[PDB]
Amino acid sequence: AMESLVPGFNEKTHVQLSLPVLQVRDVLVRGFGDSVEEVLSEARQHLKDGTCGLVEVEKGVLPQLEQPYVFIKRSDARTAPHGHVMVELVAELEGIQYGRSGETLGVLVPHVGEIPVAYRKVLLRKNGNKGAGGHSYGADLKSFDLGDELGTDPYEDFQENWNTKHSSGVTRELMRELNGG
Numbered sequence: 001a002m003e004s005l006v007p008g009f010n011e012k013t014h015v016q017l018s019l020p021v022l023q024v025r026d027v028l029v030r031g032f033g034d035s036v037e038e039v040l041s042e043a044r045q046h047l048k049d050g051t052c053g054l055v056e057v058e059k060g061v062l063p064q065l066e067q068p069y070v071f072i073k074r075s076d077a078r079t080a081p082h083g084h085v086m087v088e089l090v091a092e093l094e095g096i097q098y099g100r101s102g103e104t105l106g107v108l109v110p111h112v113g114e115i116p117v118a119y120r121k122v123l124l125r126k127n128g129n130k131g132a133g134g135h136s137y138g139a140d141l142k143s144f145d146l147g148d149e150l151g152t153d154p155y156e157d158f159q160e161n162w163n164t165k166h167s168s169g170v171t172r173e174l175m176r177e178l179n180g181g
Contacts, residue, residue: 003078006086014086014123015048020111021118022053024061028112031066034177036091036132040149043070043089043108044162047124054120056106065107067093068178072122074102075129084121088129091146093178098134098141127160144178 001007024030032042046052054072055061062069068091079086085105106120133145147154151167154160174180 003076005081006079009081009086009123013126013128015126016084017047017120017122017124019047019050019052019054019106019120019122020116021057021106021120022055022109022111022114023057023117024055024064024109026114027053027055027061027065027109028114029110030064031069032108032110033068035150035175035180036068036093036144036146036178037148037150037175039068039070039091040089040130040132040147041151041162041165041167042110043091044124044149045165046110047108051111052108053111053114053116054106054122055109056120057117062095062107065109067095070108072105072108072124073100073131074105075125077102081123084123086123088125088131090130091132093144096138096141096143098138098143099131099136101131101135126163130160146178150175 032039070091072087073090075088130147132147151170152160
């Protein structure tokens with residue numbers, strides 16, 4: 001069950017994405033922001049509008065991308081429709097893995113314009129997901145652990161509802177760089 005396509009997946013919990021695959025060579029603006037909070041927010045918002053490209057070309061792309069970057073990681077190494085891949089968002093600074101949850105398809109890199117080399121259909125979690133710190137803590141990794149996508153911080157009553165996300169007045173002061181200070 002579900003490993004071979006979830007029979008009737010909820011589009012209200014999982015959103016169907018059709019993303020253009022970029023090569024790092026062509027990627028304009030090779031990062032979302034300076035802080036993990038920003039990049040996860042930029043990930044979700046640009047995925048819907050199609051203003052985000054997906055890098056799933058090679059591995060040499062990634063060391064040439066700007067941190068924090070957001071990879072598209074399967075929630076399970078299983079759980080995939082025929083053509084669609086069920087995934088979720090994870091942002092990472094050093095590229096250190098601490099809960100890949102499966103395979104990484106692509107990197108989310110903003111699309112200003114550029115020739116796609118491939119296209120990918122992935123299903124992104126609208127809610128119930130993310131691991132920008134470490135599910136297994138990366139085995140005493142001690143990372144920043146910032147699953148707080150700027151406004152949609154799911155530890156303060158917020159239920160991770162980025163639908164109609166107006167995080168304008170969430171900018172206290174130090175909302176720049178993973179190293180706020």
